């Protein structure tokens, strides 16, 4: 479905502090009120290889890290170095290496569905690490992955960008109140990681950790929006936190505000 965002996709364009300033920036941003694709995080496995057109806005309402990690590259077949963000409870395993990719790389666990237990039929998430050039492992932290159905409080908004051989990951954890499609709200994304990989990313792919007779499809989804070079007017409050933004080419009123 062609869902429409409202004001999401705003991230701090740099590491400069500004107080009560209406700064204007010309940078890769997600246009306001643009269609973003909505997928089913599930016989029916939604896990295609989507293009990486100079940036991606990845959002999801999953819990307990249903979507483990991502794949970035141009070939994604170990012939050229590919960047891997496979991540689970412990921590990320950021690994830019020519890792062999199976055509069906998902854990595939039917856990706590019919007889309340965690089982593992296959472990084909990793095929082989034929060669590598650089790897990095972060500290074994522990996010709030505990089972709490309740109402979703994890909108894992992410922005992936790669410019000048630098791969920048912006992200922010925004708790939400409505389990329906993306609720309206404003929240800027802080810088999370910067990597001097200098690799070359034309396609990307997500990684999932989840026979077909009477299968109860899981409840989860992820949105994939695309960045574009645009001019924005960012409002910094007295504390240096971006409180509001204006898209300088959305409509004539926004253009006047920017001017």
């Amino acid at each position: 479905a062609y869902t429409n965002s409202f004001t999401r996709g705003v991230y701090y364009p740099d590491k400069v502090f500004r107080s009560s300033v209406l700064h204007s920036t010309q940078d890769l941003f997600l246009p306001f009120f643009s269609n973003v694709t909505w997928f089913h995080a599930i016989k029916r496995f939604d896990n295609p290889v989507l293009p990486f057109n100079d940036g991606v806005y990845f959002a999801s309402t999953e819990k307990s890290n249903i979507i483990r990690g991502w794949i970035f590259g141009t070939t994604l077949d170990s012939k050229t170095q590919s960047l891997l963000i496979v991540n689970n409870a412990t921590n990320v395993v950021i690994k830019v290496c020519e890792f062999q990719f199976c055509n069906d790389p998902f854990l595939g666990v039917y856990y706590h569905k019919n007889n309340k237990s965690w089982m593992e039929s296959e472990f084909r998430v990793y095929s082989s690490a034929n060669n590598c050039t650089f790897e990095y492992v972060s500290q074994p932290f522990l996010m709030d992955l505990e089972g709490k159905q309740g109402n979703f409080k994890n909108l894992r908004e992410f922005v992936f960008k790669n410019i000048d051989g630098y791969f920048k990951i912006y992200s922010k954890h925004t708790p939400i109140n409505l389990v329906r499609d993306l609720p309206q709200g404003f929240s800027a994304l802080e810088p999370l990681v910067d990597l001097p990989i200098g690799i070359n990313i034309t396609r990307f792919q997500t990684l999932l950790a989840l026979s077909s007779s009477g299968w109860t499809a899981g409840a989860a989804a992820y949105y994939v929006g695309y960045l574009q070079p645009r001019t924005f007017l960012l409002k910094y409050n007295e504390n240096g936190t971006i409180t509001d933004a204006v898209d300088c080419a959305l409509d004539p009123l926004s253009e006047t505000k920017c001017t």
Partner: protein, 389 residues
């Protein structure tokens, strides 16, 4: 003024600026160190023709502990220098460690005779990678002789340079110079493969405050006075910019704290003088400057007056009131009066008068005077034609 006689008035002169007292450089501590210790302390290197290759990247290629150490015997950089190694950045460095007969060290030289050179490891004419070569006689010498380092490199099939003599009897402690085994490690680095990620260690200096200094924070160079700031940066933010897009706050990399940056005090210098034949005495005004900073750059003073327009030197502060003679600013004027000296005062707007106003009282003149006054008005200025060509 390009004149030997200066008319009465106040004249601009050379600007005054507080020169920085010292230079302060701050950088994050050097934690990511390359595994040079492991590379040069390995128990045993690989074969000459099967030299091991270890990729070193994302670290600081510090050489203080390497060069200052006396353990090494021979070390020459044919493309770089240790002095400029510290302030040079590289993309990736590969360490190639192998043990060779002391004689083969000569063959290691680039473009040198001997087919063993290109059979094991050829050095091209443009190899800037540094080479470490240090004696390891005891380590690589066996009681009966280490025959593993065989030197039969005369294979019938020819091996081209960078395609990808059995004169040794035994490595023994009694072997003479040129025959003892030598540990050779090669620091071979490449460029134009990824953003630079290896760089030499960067020194840091102590932190100073409330002094005009030349600060260098993470490559941000500026001059100013660093002060403790009550601002609150976000964890990821480093700098602080004002509305005019100028740096005004900075976060110290070593200690996470916010320091305000204030430009070093500066301002024009004006000389208040009466006419040259009235007197040769003068006073100096430092426009928009504290009177406590002036002697930094008449230093003694003995007559200082902190006015809203700046510190005034050489003028006595009198606290009567007269008509303005030489304007200074903020209602302060200077004049030459009785011995004679320059006096600074708050100018009087005029004699105070209280009209005897009433109900039913009127004032009527009795005897006029005829007054003639002169008014001058420019009407034109000299014509001027300029031949552009």
């Amino acid at each position: 003024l390009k004149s030997f006689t200066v008319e009465k008035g106040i004249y601009q002169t050379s600007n005054f600026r507080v020169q920085p007292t010292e230079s302060i450089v701050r950088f994050p501590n050097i934690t990511n160190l390359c595994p040079f210790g492991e590379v040069f302390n390995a128990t045993r290197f690989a074969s000459v023709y099967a030299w091991n290759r270890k990729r070193i990247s994302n670290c600081v290629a510090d050489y203080s502990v390497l060069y200052n150490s006396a353990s090494f015997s021979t070390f020459k950089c044919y493309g770089v220098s240790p002095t400029k190694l510290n302030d040079l950045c590289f993309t990736n460095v590969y360490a190639d460690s192998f043990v060779i007969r002391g004689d083969e060290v000569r063959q290691i030289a680039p473009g040198q005779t001997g087919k063993i050179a290109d059979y094991n490891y050829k050095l091209p004419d443009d190899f800037t990678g540094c080479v470490i070569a240090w004696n390891s006689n005891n380590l690589d010498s066996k009681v009966g002789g280490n025959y593993n380092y065989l030197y039969r490199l005369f294979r019938k099939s020819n091996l081209k340079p960078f395609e990808r003599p059995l004169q040794s009897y035994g490595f023994q402690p009694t072997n003479g110079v040129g025959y003892q085994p030598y540990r050779v490690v090669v620091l071979s680095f490449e460029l134009l493969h990824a953003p630079a990620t290896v760089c030499g260690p960067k020194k840091s200096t102590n932190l100073v405050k409330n002094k005009c200094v030349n600060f260098n924070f993470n490559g941000l160079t500026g001059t100013g006075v660093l002060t403790e700031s009550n601002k609150k940066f976000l964890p990821f933010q480093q700098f602080g910019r004002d509305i005019a897009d100028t740096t005004d706050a900075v976060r110290d990399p070593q200690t996470l704290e916010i320091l305000d940056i204030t430009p070093c005090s500066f301002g024009g210098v004006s000389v208040i003088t009466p006419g040259t034949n009235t007197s040769n005495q003068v006073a100096v005004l430092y426009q928009g400057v504290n009177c406590t900073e002036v002697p930094v750059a008449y230093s003694t003073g003995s007559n200082v007056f902190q006015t809203r327009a700046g510190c005034l030197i050489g003028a006595e502060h009198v606290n009567n009131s007269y008509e303005c003679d030489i304007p200074i600013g903020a209602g302060i004027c200077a004049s030459y009066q009785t011995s004679q000296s320059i006096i600074a005062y708050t100018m009087s707007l005029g004699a105070e008068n209280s009209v005897a106003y009433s109900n039913n009282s009127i004032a009527i003149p009795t005897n006029f005077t005829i007054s003639v006054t002169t008014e001058i008005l420019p009407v034109s200025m000299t014509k001027t034609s300029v031949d552009c060509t």
